[PDB]
Amino acid sequence: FNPFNVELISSLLESIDFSMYIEKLPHCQLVGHVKRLHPNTHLEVHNEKFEVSKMIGKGAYGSVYVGKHLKSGKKVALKQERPTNYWEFYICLEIHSRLTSEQMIPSYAHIDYALVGNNSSVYISEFSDYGSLIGVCNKVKSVTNRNMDEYVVMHLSCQMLDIVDHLHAMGIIHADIKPDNFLLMKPICADPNEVSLQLIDFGVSIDMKLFPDNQTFNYVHHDDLFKCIEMRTGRPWTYQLDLYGLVSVMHVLLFGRYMEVVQRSPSTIWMPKTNVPRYFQRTMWENIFRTLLNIRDCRTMPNLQQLRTQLKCALAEKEKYVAEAISKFNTILQ
């Protein structure tokens, strides 16, 4: 089964009368034709006017621009895609419909406004002055000429685990977890539990609530870098795809390099090719990587909270150092 299938997606949205729903939402405007986003212009969704300022990214089937909601002063990201990505709007609506935790609401991108044309969509969400984890990771390395501090990475990993855990509890697989898809929304606090990260870009996410209990998938990313362990080994997967993505992000933060996964010869166990330095919290990181990469079946996922506990315990051994490291990290962010 391939859960990214365009015709399946159309079928699913039609099965729940999605168009009839979004036609009623005051923050969604249906239009005939959506203009291509262009720098230094303005855009309206109903009564709300936005400055469209600068290009962030521009691909074959869309672009991202930074702008501002004039009334609020709120800096926004404008994401344009062709053809219209109704599915992304659906996932985001469902996430915010299923949330209960006050703690977790800022942890997921919210589509503030939607302009939906025959040809393309534009989704408006919050812009971060600090950028994605990629941008932060690279800025830190640029300034310090060192990798991100191990304990700062533990703190961020604990947060990412909490965000993914709550997402999976809602029956949603993000399906494209990478350092680009966590934004840092505000500086870190010394308390591992307040979230400063936000997961974004639900454009290819999977809603498990639309499938039977016990549904699995066996679609395989052709690209080997994005192949999760099950895809490499002729096996079904569900939530493992995100847990693989999670490790890949932890790997980039820790090492400044992208993750390559191999079997730990002569075991059948998959681990990153990179050896965790002995002076790191080696046993802990190896536990985390092994647990998240090597899952028996789709019936039971590893306990992500137990992993958070492991990280908190390590953070607790050096409270003074960690506060200093966080302080230094936040200063680099300014």
Binding site for ATP: residue ranges? 79
Query: Running DSSP on this structure, what letter comes out for residue 47?
Result: T
**Quick one: which of 62, 60, 64, 65 has its CA closest to 84?**
62
Q: How many CB atoms lie within 10 A of CB 14?
A: 11
All residues at 6 or more sequence positions from 279 whose CB lies less than 8 Å from its CB, including other chains: none
Determine whether 110 is exposed, middle or buried from the number of CB atoms within 10 Å of its CB (0-12, 13-18, 19+). middle
Using DSSP's 3-state secondary structure scheme, residue 40 falls into: coil
Distances (CA, A) of 292 to 126, 180, 210, 228, 244: 30, 20, 25, 11, 6
**Quick one: which of 158, 150, 55, 45 has its CA closest to 107?**
158
Specify the amino acid at residue 53.
Answer: S
What is d(CA 274, CA 251) in angstroms, rounded to the nearest whole number?
9
What is d(CA 123, CA 88) in angstroms, rounded to the nearest whole number?
9
What is d(CA 283, CA 302) in angstroms, rounded to the nearest whole number?
17
Binding annotation? 79
Query: Running DSSP on this structure, what letter comes out for residue 270?
Result: E
Cα 249–327–161 angle (5° rounding)? Answer: 30
Specify the amino acid at residue 331.
Answer: T
Rg (CA), the chain: 20
